[PDB]
Design a protein around this ligand. Structure first.
Ligand SMILES: CC(=O)CSCCNC(=O)CCNC(=O)[C@H](O)C(C)(C)COP(=O)(O)OP(=O)(O)OC[C@H]1O[C@@H](n2cnc3c(N)ncnc32)[C@H](O)[C@@H]1OP(=O)(O)O
Ligand SMILES: CC(=O)CSCCNC(=O)CCNC(=O)[C@H](O)C(C)(C)COP(=O)(O)OP(=O)(O)OC[C@H]1O[C@@H](n2cnc3c(N)ncnc32)[C@H](O)[C@@H]1OP(=O)(O)O
Ligand SMILES: CC(=O)CSCCNC(=O)CCNC(=O)[C@H](O)C(C)(C)COP(=O)(O)OP(=O)(O)OC[C@H]1O[C@@H](n2cnc3c(N)ncnc32)[C@H](O)[C@@H]1OP(=O)(O)O
Ligand SMILES: CC(=O)CSCCNC(=O)CCNC(=O)[C@H](O)C(C)(C)COP(=O)(O)OP(=O)(O)OC[C@H]1O[C@@H](n2cnc3c(N)ncnc32)[C@H](O)[C@@H]1OP(=O)(O)O
Ligand SMILES: [Cl-]
Ligand SMILES: [Cl-]
Ligand SMILES: [Cl-]
Ligand SMILES: [Cl-]
Ligand code: NA
Ligand code: NA
Ligand code: NA
Ligand code: NA
Ligand code: NA
Ligand code: NA
Ligand code: NA
Ligand code: NA
Ligand code: NA
Lengths: 409, 409, 408, 409
């Protein structure tokens, strides 16, 4: 009695997103649904309909992601995955995953990426956790920088969203080629990212925008944050909830952070979704004053295995044969020779002996340089077939800059 | 009125350690002081004495540490650093550091390592945070393993310390060449590590020892843990405080963890001082069920710069000229050419142009592969002088297995 | 001060506003509007000082299931307040005298209420007769015993309107077996299912579930609110359950299982359950469902021989009760109760008494939720003939404990 | 290989109890282990021994229990059930239950009773939760009694354990025939129950004993309690932890409670293990001021079904045929005619048509009058075969005084 189909029109879109919020036990956020519609492609939003309502949903945004080495490649940003409590554990998600992965392949996207409400959901479909994020937090009065940290001669301004959006996109585009995992932001995505959502206001305050300018007036850094006022038994106790800080040079980055850390009335700061190798972690004079809680961020599903492996660059030279088992999509299973380095990458079927045996989820887990292939082999999740192969492959799959979580979807 | 000197005899040793505990605001632990005396060299324990008592202390243990690549080299394990509250902030620590670093150099140790009560203390002497540790914890009923994790056909036994110490040292020696940062354990160090200290008992329970045996009877894994009994509103609520788990193969490691996780009455587990890349993190089916809190562990002070850089191995080939500034010991400043890879390492003074400029503390921070030289350069703490040099040097200084904290000192 | 009833609609608004004010709350417009539709102004009394109401006391005309399944009229006492400017001057005592006389004249044999503070009402002859359980736990610890049959039914999330087309008939069929439950008219259902703003602030919007047999017959329902949440290691939502009922064991168990298996949920809470809620025995691990027990309904017997003759008794009894009614001494007397599963009669007698008790303690045992024998062991009830309390206590019991009705 | 055997001697007893405590994640309590030995029979304490140590335990004490109606019958008080974490989930418990239930049967005990660390353990062996207990607690200043509660004219004395034990046993013996579920206490059991255990001292204070005397000097009530001193921001905040209060008449019960409730410096009282129909619950003027948290207490295993059913008395007349299915002891499965009332009880196999079908665990659950057979039928756990049959049987298996938990074992 169920029909697998895409969103037909705008009313159908409202009904679809309403069902998704209901499965997440939330009232539909009108402001979020409206802004996100502007980068939603209805034919990428599938689900099951019982004739009366949507009982399952699964969607994807057409996005682009930075790989190690700086290439920006199309990626399916999977989103809105739900099944109604009346229809769960009957394989509806499994069916939607089969359809979606086939659709992703046909659109020429070599991989898919998602955040997981519960990480164990997706490994069975070939996804592997590839990126972690850090919640960084501390008492601002304990976060002095090392004495050598140059703050430069720039200035900061608090600006409107409109003024922010006139300079922040150019700053963002200049920085993210060095930050694998970040995704391109069209104006539509910036509108969602800077939305002063009612949900986030309730936990803190209205969103604020900061621009950092060099002494010649060039915008070179920005911050997005929300204040949470507060008072304690001995004085003020406000908290800054930082959404994002970027700078095109070390001085603009350090100076923008110092602006936030030195704000009056503030005693606490928290940066959710930072990099596990966020520069700020090493700027501070006292390392543990910046607490660091690490969790899963992005899972990667490699859809076109040899294409994806050829699209990134590798931290050192590698020539390795990978026996890749794709349990959910066995047509992808194969023996692939990967030849790669800082300046090249190629991958194709080979009949030569395999060096390493691994599943496609674990190949996905190592793909962004955030999980060590050698640790997975030590854990017994990956099998070395030829001596020394994992050593060199693990280093090549790594990268000197940890992957980091993109803006959320 | 102060005399800088070493510990003279056993009574002087008691007085010395008593003053150290007093500065740490603690009653002297008789059991710890007694067991640690057996690997203490009195001539390595310096301090200031006012004629009546010790007013400052600084010591070092002669130890050996695993570097990336597996070499085990002598290291000064710095310990017992205190200055009495009546004599603080008059430069006594600074003076003891000058004496100790000279003594370390003369003994042929190329580097020193320490844990820091407060990490910001030691950077001014050339130490850099090189290793982080993870507190791993979770509800045991949320820590099921991935379906492919083979537990093997081994068995576990709860044993006496004496029985544990007859098999655990051989297991430990076989595993740690793959775990840079771990230190050699003599019988004397094992006696300290396995001490059923009264302090740790108060927070949990008596220390317990587990041995894992292969089906042929070969000891292949071990665990040290303490139970903390407890009851909640709806049933038992005990907590296991894990001190150490090791295995010589993936099955013994996974099986020993499963033994602890499946213990009856237990609801919570915590492993302090794990690796930030602990295998257990990737064995679990649901990544975030194992919470991960990351902090500083070991700081490295390079004492013989070219020797230390030649004693480890590098994850890929590197040929780089480092302009190294040693602020505390300016005689070490110099321009060093590092040539290294998986199979070789050499380092010596050169007059060729420098590729990278950095201080000795930051060279120490990257030395164990736990901090990325590229991130330090992005943070502005290190300066790239020639294009592309940091990229290749950062990868070479890395390693496919994160460094991890040794047993404490 | 004038003791009067509500005179018109604006007077109703002002009366409810003063009552909310005594409870230290802002008047809830949605609740005041819906409850008006089953309010009889002539049953809402109070004191008015010329400028405002300074005391209130009211009753709804309801009907309650007694042990044995009889459904009888009951005064559902409500909206009892005295302003802080006029408290401890006897205003409540006066309203209680008037109201209890009014209840008697309307042919209701008993009154029932919930109490903000239970010690208020004993002095007027009320006794706590029913208790309720807050049942809660981690949903992943609430697996059922292996023999619990979930049957072949299905569940659907439905609108309030769809819910109210099926739930009343399910409710009507179940409650004759649940003494203490009260009849629900459409107006009472509208209040019970109101998506009140105050409950939204604590959790979420109210949701409705219908359970259908494999042939399509609606046989169970649930009312619940979700409270989303996240912890340090994953989701941590809570389900706040308002009511679950089923006309057979399979639909009851399947409906609970639907709630317990909901994704992202980790905690469930059922306020106001029975102390013998079937769920307590379905779960494989008894203490995984925490159980906190408190007072629910207090009973005031207004026509003692009628009330005692209207219920049925779990076993045969022939006992003479010497009843003392301090507040309404016209009720004091010696009554012969003869009763059993299939009969009940009560009348004044001159025969020797077997048991001496107050009207409040007679009310406490009237619903089978408090043991007359425990009250005698406590010294609150006096046995005058050996063996009498044992047999009367069993007769006043019932194999299904009384449970709390919907709020009033 | 493993050997199932009983404890052989006193050293063996020490090792057995030590393994039991170890499985409970506790250090062995020397005080408890020595006092409890005095009522232990070594031939009732079974377990598995691997040649080197005990790896599982299961025992029973020979006790006697009050049934509805006042009869005091032998019961196996099951105790010390553990399986070592090295040997769990291999059926060792099941094998010990198989042996123990046969042993109980042969000793002529008609039933067994236990407390459960986790209640779901024992249903599979035919145990049913039959008695609940209440933690009763509150602010003593909120626990005034109803105005008609007569305190009588007795007096109270604080006494030594020795003086307490000269009067409390006779008070207890006279009261418990009216409290089904209570167990007889020999001098040896009293010694355990009044032990000033070091565990309970750490949570509160040393155990204290109170006697209540009638005007003629007769001891008629007692209390066992521990104080927990404390101070708040606005004055004292001590707590009384009550272990037991009993009296032979309502005045001595009420006066003894009033003595505790009126103690100076106290603000909070807690009574663990009370009856869900404890008289105190009805003495208080404000019912909810005495908070009431209810959980499982005793599980019952009917071993000789027709004898156990004939040993208790029934709250009203009953004549019912029970089709009983006993899963773990199928030798007990059969169709039994129960005829009973306040003054008689008989039970025997019958071929008459059955009225009710139920499992032995649910017959055990209703056996003490603490769980309603009618509610279990409404839940679907019990099946009514002839209309109206459950109604009268449920009333008969009930009792006007709720069963209550005995002293711990
Ligand atoms: C991309 C995004 O939108 C961010 S991720 C959000 C995912 N959605 C949610 O968390 C909202 C609440 N949960 C749901 O709506 C459903 O549980 C989801 C997660 C969509 C799954 O839908 P179903 O239709 O129930 O999945 P289904 O294919 O039946 O499951 C196939 C396997 O996946 C497992 N699985 C699915 N969801 C799971 C879960 N939440 N936790 C644990 N296991 C889960 C099922 O147990 C089954 O395992 P087996 O029986 O093969 O051993
Ligand atoms: C190896 C081990 O034993 C593990 S590390 C444990 C270190 N010991 C403790 O934490 C115990 C309590 N603290 C102490 O005993 C003393 O504060 C320690 C940490 C030993 C330092 O002794 P002092 O004699 O006071 O150090 P001193 O040479 O005077 O300090 C030189 C610089 O180091 C800075 N410094 C020293 N200890 C510091 C501290 N704890 N926090 C922040 N800054 C500190 C001083 O402010 C000064 O900076 P400046 O004036 O040059 O800008
Ligand atoms: C049916 C429902 O609406 C659910 S129950 C909600 C009851 N209302 C509230 O809780 C709102 C806040 N409280 C109030 O409005 C007043 O305190 C209420 C409860 C209406 C009582 O009004 P008053 O006019 O003050 O009562 P009054 O007849 O003077 O009191 C008669 C006896 O009852 C006692 N009493 C009354 N309310 C009490 C209370 N809340 N707590 C303790 N004792 C109380 C008085 O102390 C007095 O005892 P004594 O001096 O004769 O020994
Ligand atoms: C009388 C007293 O002493 C008070 S009760 C104390 C019980 N002992 C403890 O709690 C100490 C910690 N736990 C233990 O020592 C062991 O887990 C106990 C409870 C003794 C069970 O020993 P085992 O040897 O592991 O039991 P075993 O016969 O293998 O289990 C038979 C069934 O009983 C289930 N079960 C046993 N213990 C359980 C438990 N603790 N929780 C949940 N299920 C349990 C097992 O899963 C198995 O189910 P299935 O596979 O047949 O579906
Ligand atoms: Cl896979
Ligand atoms: Cl330096
Ligand atoms: Cl009364
Ligand atoms: Cl059974
Ligand atoms: Na950059
Ligand atoms: Na972020
Ligand atoms: Na290894
Ligand atoms: Na460690
Ligand atoms: Na029913
Ligand atoms: Na209710
Ligand atoms: Na009695
Ligand atoms: Na006091
Ligand atoms: Na007790």
């Amino acid at each position: 009695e169920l029909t697998l189909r895409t969103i037909a029109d705008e009313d159908d879109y409202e009904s679809y997103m309403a069902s998704a919020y209901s499965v997440f036990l939330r009232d539909p956020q009108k402001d979020e649904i409206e802004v996100n519609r502007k980068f939603t492609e209805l034919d990428r939003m599938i689900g099951f309909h019982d004739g009366k309502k949507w009982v399952a949903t699964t969607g994807a945004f057409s996005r682009h992601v930075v790989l190690p080495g700086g290439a920006v490649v199309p990626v399916a940003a999977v989103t809105a995955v739900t099944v109604s409590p009346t229809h769960r554990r009957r394989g509806l998600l499994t069916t939607m995953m089969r359809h979606q992965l086939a659709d992703i392949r046909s659109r020429g996207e070599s991989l898919a990426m998602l955040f997981a409400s519960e990480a164990l959901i997706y490994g069975r479909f070939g996804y592997g956790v590839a990126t972690e994020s850090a919640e960084l937090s501390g008492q601002v009065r304990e976060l002095a920088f090392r004495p050598t940290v140059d703050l430069g001669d720039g200035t900061l301004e608090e600006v409107s969203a409109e003024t922010f959006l006139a300079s922040a996109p150019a700053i963002y585009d200049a920085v993210i080629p060095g930050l694998p995992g970040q995704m391109s932001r069209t104006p539509e995505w910036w509108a969602s990212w800077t939305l002063d959502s009612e949900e986030l206001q309730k936990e803190s305050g209205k969103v604020r925008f900061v621009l950092h300018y060099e002494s010649d007036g060039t915008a070179s850094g920005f911050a997005i944050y929300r204040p949470k006022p507060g008072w304690g038994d001995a004085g003020p106790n406000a908290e800054l909830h930082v959404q994002e800080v970027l700078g095109t040079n070390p001085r603009s980055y350090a100076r923008t952070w110092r602006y936030l850390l030195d704000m009056d009335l503030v005693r606490k700061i928290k940066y959710h979704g930072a990099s596990v190798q966020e520069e700020l972690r090493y700027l501070v004079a006292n390392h543990p004053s910046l607490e660091c809680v690490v969790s899963d961020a992005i899972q990667v599903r490699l859809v076109d295995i040899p294409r994806a492996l050829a699209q990134r660059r590798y931290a050192a030279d590698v020539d390795v044969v990978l026996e890749v088992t794709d349990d959910f999509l066995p047509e992808n299973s194969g023996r692939y020779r990967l030849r790669g380095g800082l300046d090249h990458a190629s991958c194709e079927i080979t009949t030569d002996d395999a060096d390493i045996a691994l599943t496609v989820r674990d190949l996905g887990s190592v793909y962004m340089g955030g999980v060590s292939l050698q640790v997975l082999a030590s854990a017994g999740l990956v099998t070395e077939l030829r001596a020394g192969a994992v050593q060199r492959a693990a280093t090549a799959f790594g990268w000197p800059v940890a992957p980091s979580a993109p803006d959320d979807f």
